[PDB]
Design brief:
- The protein has helices at about 20-25, 75-85, 120-125, 130-150, 200, 210-225, 235-250, 250-260, 295-305, 315-320; strands spanning about 35, 40-45, 50-55, 60-70, 95-100, 110-115, 150, 160-165, 170, 180.
- It has about 325 residues and is α+β, with helices and mostly antiparallel strands.
- The protein folds into 2 domains: about 5-25 and about 115-325, Orthogonal Bundle (Transferase(Phosphotransferase), domain 1); about 25-115, 2-Layer Sandwich (Phosphorylase Kinase, domain 1).
- The strands form 3 sheets. The protein has a 6-stranded mixed β-sheet with strand order 1-5-6-4-3-2, covered by helices on one side.
- Bound molecules: 3-[(3-chloranyl-4-phenyl-phenyl)methylamino]propanamide.
- 3-[(3-chloranyl-4-phenyl-phenyl)methylamino]propanamide binds next to helix 3, helix 4, strand 8 and helix 6.
- Belongs to the protein kinase superfamily. Ser/Thr protein kinase family. CK2 subfamily.
- This is Casein kinase II subunit alpha.
């Protein structure tokens, strides 16, 4: 009678028990300020529906970040704006300072606090085992916060984590794919970046929850501790599940799809194969061994599980012995 329903093991009805205004972003009233108070400095990057600039607020000589949005779907702009306002001031969540539009073109822009992002290319060698545990803890603070607030990020990846290592400051950014969690809601599976997509998205299991961000965090941790970027290198979305299966094995993949009554796409039939469950220690080499520990492996093992319900929650994760050395 179709796939088996599922709901989050934590913060299940946080939106159900709150007023409609908190989660109804379509009904959210946005009030734009004037862009003229901002001075664009330099291009920091470019997304598919966004253009990110470094800027200065002329009124106080403060460095800000300006994200110009292509109005592809106003509903998505309203969703990002609503979520950013709801999470404002949360631990390690990018702060939305203002919302403005350019008078002439009317293109919407989000103004954020500034993060002085440390040279990551040069950073990949100076980070230690302590650094990884410390920064992992900080991302979990952000996730436990947005999950307690009924939001799932749905795009956790290195690119969306800004680190100012001189000041040990971490910010989770790009809430453009974030969504409000409503138990029983079927979500679009075309979220997150390929390398970070949870098995639920790949097998087309639409009733996912906050545990999706927990899979993405595992992908990130495995790439950090094992210095293998990305950890699951799929070449398409169908191949992505095969890359996971080569590590987690096909046995538990059927245990998963059977548990939730999932219909595997017939495109997998020829490519999936049969794979044994691998051991995390196999990924330890001379290059990475200085960042790998038993605690790190036990933690990793508990995040990268097929079954979204078996994954640690951000709270459970914060308690794990992997984090005993950090405040
Ligand atoms: N948009 C950008 O260019 C920012 C790119 N983000 C840099 C970055 C550097 C280090 C980490 C990290 C991950 C795990 C443990 C400790 C540190 C992350 Cl998640 C991200």
């Amino acid at each position: 009678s179709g796939p088996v329903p599922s709901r989050a093991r934590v913060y299940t009805d946080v939106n159900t028990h709150r007023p409609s205004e908190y989660w109804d972003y379509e009904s959210h009233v946005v009030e734009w300020g004037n862009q003229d108070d901002y001075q664009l400095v330099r291009k920091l990057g470019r997304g598919k529906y966004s253009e990110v600039f470094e800027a200065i607020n002329i009124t106080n000589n403060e460095k800000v970040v300006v994200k110009i949005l292509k109005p592809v779907k106003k509903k998505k702009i309203k969703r990002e704006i609503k979520i950013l306002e709801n999470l404002r001031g949360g631990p390690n969540i990018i702060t939305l300072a203002d919302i403005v539009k350019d008078p002439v073109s009317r293109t919407p822009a989000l103004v954020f606090e500034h993060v002085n992002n440390t040279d990551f290319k040069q950073l990949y060698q100076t980070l230690t085992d302590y650094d990884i545990r410390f920064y992992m803890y900080e991302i979990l603070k952000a996730l436990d916060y947005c999950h307690s607030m009924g939001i799932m990020h749905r795009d956790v990846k290195p690119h969306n984590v800004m680190i100012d290592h001189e000041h040990r400051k971490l910010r989770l950014i790009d809430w453009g794919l974030a969504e409000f969690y409503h138990p029983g809601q079927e979500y679009n599976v075309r979220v997150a970046s390929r390398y970070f997509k949870g098995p639920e998205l790949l097998v087309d299991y639409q009733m996912y929850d906050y545990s999706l961000d927990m899979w993405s965090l595992g992908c990130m941790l495995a790439s950090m501790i094992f210095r293998k970027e990305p950890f699951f290198h799929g070449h398409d979305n169908y191949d992505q599940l095969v890359r996971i299966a080569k590590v987690l094995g096909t046995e538990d993949l059927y245990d998963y799809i059977d548990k939730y009554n999932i219909e595997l796409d017939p495109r997998f039939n020829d490519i999936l194969g049969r794979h044994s469950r691998k051991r995390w220690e196999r990924f330890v080499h001379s290059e990475n061994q200085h960042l790998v520990s038993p605690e790190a492996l036990d933690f990793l093992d508990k995040l990268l599980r097929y079954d979204h319900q078996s994954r640690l929650t951000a709270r459970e994760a914060m308690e794990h012995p992997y984090f005993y050395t950090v405040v």
